[PDB]
Symmetry: D3
Subunit: 237 residues, 6 copies
């Protein structure tokens, strides 16, 4: 067991889907996994390991923000043999043509955090996802008839940012989604030798102001989870 995960080598699959909310991980294990088994509950960060069309799969929340997910993704990679991490969460849109419920694949991740500068001697480190994983997700998406944009995300440290102007700069440079973890997960993966990918569903719109609503949430969310699970299968082949 590690400082933040009470489990043992073997309890997790080599791939792990990770939403921010611990209750979402649970819902996922109950809606997409067979023989779901709870493997962790320290600090309430629920973790599950089951099967999907025969494939062993794990799902566990990672909390909010870079510092939080870095801890879990790190422990999973060094003490439980996890090879692939797949973040499945929500994000805020800045581009007018990017509407709600839209699915975005984070090929890269911009951030205003200092974690990567500390790792890269104060220079610019391009936090990127594993190419094959991105490719898998795009193909699984087409096979499901679900749209998907591939590009840059922005991992912010402050959900309530005092710098309003920064959103215009984001828009100008084509940021597809604003969240709070991608840049950190790519840093950890690169540092500890693993692969990662971040997939997000456009919740609210930073401009228009309007979060998720009705039953559209679940359906769109299920599409994201579906895309992630199928991408793992295309990767095993």
């Amino acid at each position: 067991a590690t400082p933040h995960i009470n489990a043992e080598m073997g309890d997790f699959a080599d791939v792990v889907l990770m939403p921010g909310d611990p209750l979402r991980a649970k819902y996922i294990a109950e809606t997409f996994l067979e023989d779901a088994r709870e493997v962790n509950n320290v600090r309430g960060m629920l973790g599950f390991t089951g099967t999907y069309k025969g494939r062993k799969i794990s799902v566990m929340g990672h909390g909010m923000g870079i510092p939080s997910c870095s801890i879990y993704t790190k422990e999973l990679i060094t003490d439980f043999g996890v090879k692939k991490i797949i973040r499945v969460g929500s994000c805020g849109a800045v581009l007018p043509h990017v509407k709600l419920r839209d699915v975005v694949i984070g090929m890269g991740a911009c951030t205003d955090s200092k974690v990567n500068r500390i790792r890269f001697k104060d220079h610019d480190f391009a936090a990127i996802a594993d190419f094959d994983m991105v490719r898998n997700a795009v193909d699984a998406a087409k096979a499901l008839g679900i749209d998907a944009r591939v590009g840059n995300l922005f991992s912010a440290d402050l959900f309530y940012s005092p710098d309003g102007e920064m959103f215009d700069v984001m828009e100008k440079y084509g940021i597809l989604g604003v969240e709070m973890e991608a840049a950190g997960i790519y840093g950890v993966a690169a540092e500890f030798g693993a692969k990662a990918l971040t997939i997000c569903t456009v919740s609210d719109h930073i401009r228009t102001h309007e979060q998720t609503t009705a039953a559209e949430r679940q359906t769109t969310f299920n599409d994201m989870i579906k895309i992630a699970l199928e991408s793992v299968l295309l990767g095993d082949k």
Copy 2:
């Protein structure tokens, strides 16, 4: 209700104690509060409200990291009328003379994050606690016959930092403890006009390396909690 808290104005007291672990919050409510009632469960971040010796008090977890605690404290202050926040957690030791089971009070907090620089035009903002709250905590500790150390804490973004040379620096400049939220909580308090304080017990010693396993460590964690509760009573006078 706010994006991360499903409650209404009044469900929280004007004073909230915040441990990092939501399970630790339930522990506080059931151990020290009377007539406790759960007021939040969003994302599993349990929040409770009850009374201590007749005073209305609230306790709620804030997750790990500056980005996480920044959201919760911000929403409490601007949407729930909270005026005081008291973080109660654990920290890693840096100074040789700082022994285990020592109660540390963070009058100030150094940090690795750039959240405060975003706020302060890229200059040095000295993240500090509220003076009266610090004094109340020192007096409450004395009344209980407990020796409290007041000084600087260090708030890191990476629990698993890639540079160990930084620990000598923290020691050279007198940092009493290493945790992950103080600097962020103080930035929020100053940004939105509220008051905050961080109290910690030393759970490990990055120096001689010393974990913890005894009824004695659990006795000191409770002393810290009693120090926080009693200090609010002193403040009301």
Copy 3:
């Protein structure tokens, strides 16, 4: 005509292959293009426009370093309707398993330059290539039976860097190739609304010290040019 290119709207195709060396552009127009026509010679930066299997194509050098290529890629994009830029050059390897003559596709680009920080309010901008272009290049590569690694490149400002330690950091984070333009071309593309991709051939080895040699250069170089030209065709489909 623009300040650095004496030509007119229509002289360039909507796609342009760009090596660093002006003499290479010429060699390319003479070895892979039909009806090659010189369209520019200002400052000696030779530019050509011809045909490849029917497709209109242009090839022009961009000089050495971020400041140099930013100027040309900018003018091509705003005054000659260029839609896609494809850099084809050399790079130094840092990873032991990455040997000479190897072909690398730059999905992302790290840099120690300040150009992107100036554009992104001093935060971390992840300089990335267009996903489809990367995908096209990988497929064209498999079709030619030529190996190709997809990942991060490092765009350096100083060929003769005084910071030797930085190469160990590069290696640690998996940098596949060290060159001097990618990070800038991705910045310009994002700023002016175009698409770009950088493909490099591993020349010397920053560690072992041994640049190109014999006739292996041309053959491997021709493979790179072939991959780039075929990727454009897969993109038209």
Copy 4:
């Protein structure tokens, strides 16, 4: 003797009062101390030692700016056994509810200087005062009927700053006063393991020019000195 102090060990007491202007050190010694003797005159920075109600105390000017005071506070601490330094001077205010002639105590000190970043691996160091010294001053003030405010100060490198928008940022974050030494002195104290405190009287209000007679000023200056001196006696208890 030291580069800037022509004296030997034992000439200075373990507690030193330091005003900005050197002419004030002469006034302090003849107005509050008994049996005073001169201990330094280098560069015209007069230094005196004597007693206040039987307590051995020294007083000497530190000049203007972080660099200047860092020279003196460093030499006093490592070469003359000084344990406590108390800066007594004036400051400009930015907060409306902070009246002219108010007494401000610096529990913390923000700054636009780079000295602390150079010391703290380019991270955020929270330059704070010794807590007991802060409470001593507060209680001495109360005992003298003088009410004082405790909070942040801002140590500027440029009295005539090119940026006027920073004062807005200061007001927003509750800065009580602007001067030019606290953050520097607090850094030195932490570097060599000593204790420090900065006390200031609002002499200017960077808002609407007010007016005060020369008599009022002298009266306020004496109050500040009394506070400093009585707080030392309280700390001895």
Copy 5:
């Protein structure tokens, strides 16, 4: 031979004039040098060696940008025994009183690049020319009856900068001209122990916007070249 220069020790004189455009280099050789011979053609960066009034002199292009000129000047100094480098180019006007056809001498050079910070531990390194070379240039200009202005130049990484607010700043602090190499050439000279100087003629006015088209502008460019040639003669004495 070096990575970018195909010549042997002796092919270059101990003094090399360097214009940005290699075609401009051929122009210099054929217009002012006697018995000129091409000594380099790698990547099309033409270099020549001949004599001026009996003195052996060399002239060679350095490309656009700090990264480009840094390579060539470095290789000349460490592998070809070159002791002096004199850049002769054009610059954009900033100050209203700085008219077209004014010869500007860069005693110092501000910059946008971070190359010198990499060199100087992230501090401020004042990139300056060699004093004797500056004086020789002023005297040579006087002898020719030409008015030379000595001061600061600004070396930019982006000819097409995304911020125009920077031009007011350059004007406020007296920058005489804007180009793209001076700061880098001075860094190299200091790093490898050589001497350098940058001379420029104003080709445009970013102020009132003024290009150039007259036999008069070509007359001033030649005056600059004669100033550089004659100044070396004064130095030999």
Copy 6:
């Protein structure tokens, strides 16, 4: 009058000599000027005005550090019509071939201070002196048989810097002397359109402690003053 100078327009000449220690301004005036009158005594920073061979000249101390001298040089320039400022002081050396008591002229000044970055949009500003003043001093030195060196100086914020490795970096880049004001004074001069120069004598050698009598020092100090004064007369020609 100004915040730090109790005098009116016309009291200071258009040229001001400024030593570090205020006691020296008294010596300069009685030793080199005729018909001297006192013009300032605030904070003990004595100011004098008089004539040297019919030339009206003023002298006054500027204190230690960038912050202090920035105060005085700013007020003299914008409130008393001062056109030229000449700092005369001492410095430590790092270069072996730079002997003790040598005369160094600062054509440029590096620094680890942040004042200029704050002025120059966080970019590199090359803090340089007025060229004519530099040549005047050189020629005055030659005329007096005194040989002087022209080059870079380093203006430190911390006399007792925590980093000892920076001195190696300084030596490598040819820094001639270390002091604490030049870069600051040069910034102010550029900000308000005036001229400045810094002249220093090597009083220390941060290498191997040497020795010099008190008589030798006085002799060297007078040489520096003569240079400064004669250079002013030359500039008038």
